[PDB]
Ligand binder design. Structure first.
Ligand SMILES: *C[C@@](*)(O)[C@H](CCCNC(=N)N)NC(=O)[C@@H]1CCCN1C(=O)[C@H](N)Cc1ccccc1
Ligand SMILES: *[C@@H]1O[C@H](CO)[C@@H](O[C@@H]2O[C@H](CO)[C@@H](O)[C@H](O)[C@H]2NC(C)=O)[C@H](O)[C@H]1NC(C)=O
Ligand code: NA
Lengths: 251, 150
């Protein structure tokens, strides 16, 4: 997270760290959507161009964390993985369209002050909140700068959703209805972006109607981090909600 | 001459992707594994190994090429000019139902996955124990809520 600040304790209790067993290494972020399902970006698990293909036994999910590196015994919970589901049409060869994956935990996890799931949007929530100008919040332990700074503690940044024509013209990469973009315009003054290592993490918006936090996006991709005229891209979670429900219900 | 409506009506014979890979059989096992959790439109006939657009992909027709996630490819059909576009509060498509339900008369959000091993979390999700449940505001959420108002 570039130009963010340290999170407060329990500010994002759904934030999950995906972690390689050996060598021991943060891979990505993720978000807890129930007591035994975790959402993440597909490219964190599978990206053949970088020779990347993690299976269930390669990984751990760590929940309730704040420190990037410290083992936070009695606060964080470490769960093994039962099963990984990558979107069947996650388009890694082109543009990371449908950059989403689900992971079923070996055993359900108990909730606490530090561990608690995020909501998924309904159509109505998505329709009213997902508009240009409105800000959501992104969290993660990824790089502090395009040219790396690992944070000592979970970072957070608030960013506005950007109009689609502006997203489209900011990049040569093909953007789809399964993505949205966020960040400040050059000449808006403020700065901020997600970066490498933040992928999988949730873009969340707090509803004014019921005050719950809804995960609207997943950190997906960008070109550098925090460049003027460039925007971070997020997997549009609502538009892939049917696939989420179907995977979960058919289990 | 040119295919309209992102080739959602399209009944042709094309069985090769733009990258000259041969379409797998829609009825094939590995193709069915990949179709298993997807949201397909009935008015789209999955014939043989022909390029179809079942999910209403903005990019048009496509087919599977092998059995792993991401192993599919678009097919190079000539589409029409179709001059319209979707903006940040525009593009619909049915999502989070089964068959236009309506009946939900003891709750006004409409929460979704059923209580068995969907697992648990749903009723309370998105309310933080140290913030919303304690009635405390975090140091920067006000910025988010204010972006809705102005
Ligand atoms: C996996 C994620 O940690 C990381 C997030 C970067 C977010 N950046 C900004 N908001 N500025 N994603 C990536 O690194 C993805 C995965 C493959 C390559 N990639 C990129 O973002 C590339 N720089 C751009 C790209 C996009 C789509 C296909 C190929 C390359
Ligand atoms: C990711 O890794 C696994 C390896 O464990 C791959 O699974 C293979 O599946 C193929 C085709 O279905 C089988 O023939 C192999 O026996 C499996 N590999 C082995 C030896 O375990 C999977 O294909 C890999 N994903 C990608 C996209 O490369
Ligand atoms: Na920028």
């Amino acid at each position: 997270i570039v130009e963010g600040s340290d999170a407060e304790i329990g500010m994002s209790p759904w934030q999950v760290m995906l972690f390689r067993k050996s060598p021991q290494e943060l891979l990505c972020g993720a978000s807890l959507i129930s007591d035994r399902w975790v959402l993440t970006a597909a490219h964190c698990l599978l990206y053949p161009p970088w020779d990347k293909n993690f299976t269930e036994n390669d990984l751990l999910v760590r929940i309730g964390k704040h420190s990037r590196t410290r083992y936070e015994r009695n606060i964080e919970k470490i769960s093994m993985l039962e099963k990984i589901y990558i979107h069947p049409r996650y388009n890694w060869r082109e543009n990371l369209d449908r950059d989403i994956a689900l992971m079923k935990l070996k055993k359900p996890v108990a909730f606490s002050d530090y561990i608690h799931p995020v909501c998924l949007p309904d159509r109505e929530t998505a329709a009213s909140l997902l508009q240009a100008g409105y800000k959501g919040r992104v969290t993660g332990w990824g790089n502090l700068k395009e040219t790396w700074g690992q944070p000592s503690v979970l970072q957070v940044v608030n960013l506005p959703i950007v109009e689609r024509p502006v997203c489209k013209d900011s990049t040569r990469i093909r953007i789809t209805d399964n993505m949205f973009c966020a960040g400040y315009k050059p000449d808006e003054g403020k700065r901020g972006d997600a970066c490498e290592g933040d992928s999988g993490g949730p873009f969340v918006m707090k509803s004014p109607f019921n005050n719950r936090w809804y995960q609207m996006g997943i950190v997906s991709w960008g070109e550098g981090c925090d460049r003027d005229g460039k925007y971070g891209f997020y997997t549009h979670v609502f538009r892939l909600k049917k696939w989420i429900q179907k995977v979960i219900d058919q289990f | 001459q040119c295919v309209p409506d992102r080739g959602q009506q399209y009944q042709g014979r094309l069985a090769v992707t733009t990258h000259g890979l041969p379409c797998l059989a829609w009825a094939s096992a590995q193709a069915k594994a990949l179709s298993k959790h997807q949201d397909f439109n009935s008015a789209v006939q999955l014939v043989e190994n022909f390029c179809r657009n079942p999910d209403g992909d903005e990019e048009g027709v496509w087919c599977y090429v092998a059995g792993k996630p991401g192993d599919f490819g678009y097919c190079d059909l000539n589409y029409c000019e179709e001059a319209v576009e979707e903006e940040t509060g525009d593009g619909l498509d049915e999502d989070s139902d089964r068959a236009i339900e309506g009946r939900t008369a003891t709750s006004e959000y409409q929460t979704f996955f059923n209580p068995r091993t969907f697992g648990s979390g749903e009723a309370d999700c998105g309310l933080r124990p140290l913030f919303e449940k304690k009635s405390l505001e975090d140091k920067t959420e006000r910025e988010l809520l204010e972006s809705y108002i102005d």
